């Protein structure tokens, strides 16, 4: 956790619904924007921490 890994996510089609409907995840709540509607917005980069 102190040496936390980061991946940059840039210039790809970001499929999201496959993450939601996997349902193997214990804690998935979302802040900033609704979960089912952030499949429809575009960003410059996404940081996977």
């Amino acid at each position: 956790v102190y040496a936390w890994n980061r991946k940059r996510i840039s210039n790809c089609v970001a499929d999201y619904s496959v993450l939601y409907n996997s349902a193997s995840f214990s804690t998935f709540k979302c802040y900033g924007v609704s979960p089912t509607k952030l499949n429809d917005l575009c960003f410059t980069n996404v940081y996977a921490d």
């Binding site: 940059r8 840039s10 210039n11 980069n45």
Partner: protein, 33 residues
């Protein structure tokens, strides 16, 4: 030694190549493109 100190990359791309023979190219940078 040109490709040294690769720091803070924000984009990466690899493609198929190109090329008494003349190669003409136009580089423009408009609207963040």
């Amino acid at each position: 030694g040109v490709y040294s100190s690769a720091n803070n990359c924000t984009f990466e791309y690899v493609s198929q190549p190109f090329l008494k023979n003349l190669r003409e190219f136009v580089f423009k940078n408009i609207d963040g493109y």
